[PDB]
């Protein structure tokens, strides 16, 4: 193993070749999924992947269509309620 | 796979070209007065300064 | 010289250089062969062969294991490890209690059991007084639940 490939940031895997060689393949690790700002709870609808994996995707498959998609829905409804209760004056 | 810099490689290349012996016609022309020179080197005896 | 032939043929046939056979009556033909084409055609002709792997049988161990399954070779004199190693500690517990919960849940689904009785038995099984389904059923039909 090359010294850089022996570094535990490469998630090895052994794989069989049509001509019978049993090679070792190397891959980088995926990031973790996004988390709300106000509660630290995972977001749904936002997929995990490296910038390579993500730039081969259209916009609307990267986040939900509701407003404030950086927030969980319980917090989204809170901010919206606050806005409307303050827009009375 | 060895990861050398280019200047160092060129210097080793010169060092390799040097390490040969005197041609036969120089000896024939000098009447056996030149048979060697001071830069014969073997890789396992005398080392270079990179 | 024939080091060259041996290595070319070995890594052509995807083998080792010791599992290779060169006919001892045609070494001149082999030596006249400096290219890969010539060594290929000699392989074809059969002057250079890949030998078959020897192998290692398992025919004695098969009979050993047959006899062990049917119940020999498992006495005190054949053991070297502790009982808690040869059979684990937490594995036993997990398989036991999983079995028990499975059975209680099936019994509840078939109406034989009400929530009160199922809860009591769940709690006793966690406490760990049953140790097997036979004990469980003995308890249930000694007491009036079945």
């Amino acid at each position: 193993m090359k010294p850089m490939y022996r570094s535990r940031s490469w998630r090895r895997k052994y794989v069989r070749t049509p001509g019978g060689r049993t090679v070792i393949h190397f891959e980088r690790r995926k990031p973790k999924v996004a988390h709300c700002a106000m509660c630290g709870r995972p977001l749904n609808g936002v997929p995990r992947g490296r910038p390579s994996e993500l730039r081969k995707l259209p916009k609307t498959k990267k986040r939900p269509e509701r407003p404030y998609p950086n927030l969980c829905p319980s917090c989204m409804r809170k901010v919206m309620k606050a806005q409307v209760r303050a827009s009375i004056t | 796979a060895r990861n050398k810099p280019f200047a160092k490689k060129l210097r080793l290349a010169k060092a390799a070209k040097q390490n040969r012996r005197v041609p036969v016609w120089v000896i024939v022309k000098t009447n056996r007065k030149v048979i060697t020179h001071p830069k014969r080197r073997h890789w396992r005896r005398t080392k270079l300064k990179e | 010289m024939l080091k060259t032939q041996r290595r070319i043929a070995a890594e052509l046939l995807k083998c080792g250089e010791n599992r290779i056979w060169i006919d001892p009556e045609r070494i001149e033909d082999v030596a006249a062969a400096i290219t890969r084409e010539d060594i290929k055609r000699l392989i074809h002709d059969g002057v250079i062969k890949k030998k078959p792997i020897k192998g290692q049988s398992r025919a004695r161990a098969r009979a050993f294991q047959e006899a062990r399954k049917k119940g020999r070779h498992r006495g005190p004199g054949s053991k070297k490890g502790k009982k808690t190693a040869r059979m684990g500690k937490k594995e036993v517990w997990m398989m036991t209690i999983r079995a028990l919960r499975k059975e209680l849940r099936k019994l509840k689904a078939e109406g034989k059991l009400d929530a009160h009785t199922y809860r009591r038995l769940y709690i006793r099984a966690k406490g760990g007084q049953f140790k097997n389904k036979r004990q469980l059923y003995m308890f249930m039909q000694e007491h009036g639940i079945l």
Binding site: - | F6, L10, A13 | -
Partner: protein, 85 residues
């Protein structure tokens, strides 16, 4: 560099001849200080051909060496004969 100074020498070895026959390639010895693009021009002018690819390596003698692939319209053997070999 400038055309007509880039190319120093053509190669005549068994490997180079094999490549001339099979791949339609030429093999040259070149001034260290030239790049793939300058080599491309140089060949185009000094020989009036269209080039497809250039690959380079510096050797263990201090010489830059170029494997040059032409487009299948032309023919290496032609210029190899136009030269000596």
């Amino acid at each position: 560099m400038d055309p007509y100074k880039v190319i120093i020498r053509p190669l005549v070895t068994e490997k180079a001849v094999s490549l001339i026959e099979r791949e339609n390639k030429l093999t040259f010895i070149v001034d260290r200080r030239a790049t793939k693009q300058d080599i491309k021009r140089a060949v185009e002018e000094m020989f009036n051909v269209k080039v497809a690819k250039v690959n380079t390596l510096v050797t263990m003698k201090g010489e830059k060496k170029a494997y040059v692939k032409l487009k299948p319209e032309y023919d290496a053997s032609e210029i190899a004969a136009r030269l000596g070999l």
